[PDB]
Amino acid sequence: GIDPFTDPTVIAENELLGAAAAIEAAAKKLEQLKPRAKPKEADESLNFEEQILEAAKSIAAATSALVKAASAAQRELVAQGKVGAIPANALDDGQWSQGLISAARMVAAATNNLCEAANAAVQGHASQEKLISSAKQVAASTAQLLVACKVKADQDSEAMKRLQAAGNAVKRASDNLVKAAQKAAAFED
Which residue range is the domain that position 143 belongs to? Predict the structure, then answer.
């Protein structure tokens, strides 16, 4: 945090928190989404908006937990001094830091775009193509953020334990979101 050398790895932590805040804000907007649910004569199998609402939050919660876990795993390496958390060796860590940082903005954008895709779905503009495509991008981008943490960090670390599970949840939730999107689409095969 407040280190006397502004180590590049710590610089990344700040960026990860910034990304987290951005994701959690989208997650917040996700909770502000009112589904097409009214006490009227609408007995259909179309609770799509709700099935998306839950899963959007499942991603939102998992994604935010993931980026915070990345920061955690990274920070563990910083505290121990096993990553390159020294400006004099920043040539090595800086490329890991920027790699993690860029990947985080990748997951941030992907997960944010999914928020926009879900935003349409909940409100009535059901776009299975947009939703599924973005979900696969979310899962791929976000789960790859774990791959970046697999670099430098050890997998059996508890910070990584939480990290791995959170990233897995993104893929799992995105799958479910895809599955649910398929329900609101007519693909007779």
Answer: 1-189
Domain count, the chain: 1
Contact 12, 74 (CB under 8 A): yes
Experimental method: NMR
Dihedral (Cα; 42, 59, 112, 116), 10-degree rounding: -10
**CATH code of 89's domain:** 1.20.1410.10
